[PDB]
């Protein structure tokens, strides 16, 4: 129930509103929870073809009451974890891409030169000091370059 807490804390009425409408369609009989079968039907409508094992695992992932079914609460939890994972994937993908664009020389790094270029390539006004400063702040392993790890870190937050 503690999870169902922050979970509902996370979402908005809007969210809940829709996640409900969605939950209702999952739930055939309209009883109050998705069964190992009610789920199977929706999955296929969603274009999958899970197996008994697969289904349960997907069920008991948020079944805190060992019911073997999912209620609109356990469900919101599930949606949340997903919402999370989705946003994380999209982020790292974008950054990953950005790194390849900034790299271009494909050495797997971003040297003060490229950093300058890309920076100077922005509209913004910048002098070398700015560039070297950003390098010094980003390059934690003090090797001159900026590795993907560091790039993830440095861009951590920025939009």
């Amino acid at each position: 129930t503690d999870q169902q807490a922050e979970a509902r804390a996370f979402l908005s009425e809007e969210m809940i509103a829709e996640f409900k409408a969605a939950f209702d369609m999952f739930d055939a009989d309209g009883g109050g929870d998705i069964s190992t079968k009610e789920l199977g039907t929706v999955m296929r409508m969603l274009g999958q073809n899970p197996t008994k094992e697969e289904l349960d695992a997907i069920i008991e992932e948020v079944d805190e009451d060992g019911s073997g079914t999912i209620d609109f609460e356990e469900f919101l939890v599930m949606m949340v974890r997903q919402m999370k994972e989705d946003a994380k994937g999209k982020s790292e993908e974008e950054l990953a891409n950005c790194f390849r664009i900034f790299d271009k020389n494909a050495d797997g790094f971003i040297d003060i030169e490229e950093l300058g270029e890309i920076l100077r390539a922005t509209g913004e006004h910048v002098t070398e000091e700015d560039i070297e400063d950003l390098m010094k702040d980003s390059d934690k392993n003090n090797d001159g370059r900026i590795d993907f790890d560091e790039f993830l870190k440095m861009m951590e937050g920025v939009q």
Binding site: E14, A22, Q82, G89, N97, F102, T122, F148, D149, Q159
Partner: protein, 141 residues
């Protein structure tokens, strides 16, 4: 006692965001341009077909194609296998890093299920209005 130092950091951010912002707009440029290359490549390796006369030509051409098919197909296969090999090489590397760091960002294989935004769209069709991402919601005015 470095009272002003605060403005320095904000700059890096302002710049970092000037960078990302730059990235994204460049990202789709390369993307489309890339595609352009794809249609040109295909442009010559298999140009808008023009069915010949009637007798020997149609038959001939047909034989021509059909043979090329086994050809290209083989190449397609060899390629698929060099991919398999590659994906393999990076999975192993995607290991030599795990048990040396732990779970790290951006695993190359990425096991992804369908997004909740997808499932929502898929199930409610028209009425699915929530550009969900992270932005929480607290009373406006």
């Amino acid at each position: 006692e470095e009272k002003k130092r605060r403005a320095a950091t904000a700059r890096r951010q302002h710049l970092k965001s000037a960078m990302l912002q730059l990235a994204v707009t460049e990202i789709e440029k390369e993307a489309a341009a890339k595609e352009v290359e794809k249609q040109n490549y295909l442009a010559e390796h298999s140009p808008p077909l023009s069915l010949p006369g009637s007798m020997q030509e149609l038959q001939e051409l047909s034989k021509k194609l059909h043979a090329k098919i086994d050809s290209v197909d083989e190449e397609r296969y060899d390629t698929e296998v060099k991919l398999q090999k590659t994906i393999k090489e990076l999975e192993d590397l995607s290991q030599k890093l795990f048990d040396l760091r732990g779970k790290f960002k951006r695993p190359p294989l990425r096991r992804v299920r369908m997004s909740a935004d997808a499932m929502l769209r898929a199930l409610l069709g028209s009425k699915h209005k929530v550009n969900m991402d992270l932005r929480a919601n607290l009373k406006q005015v």
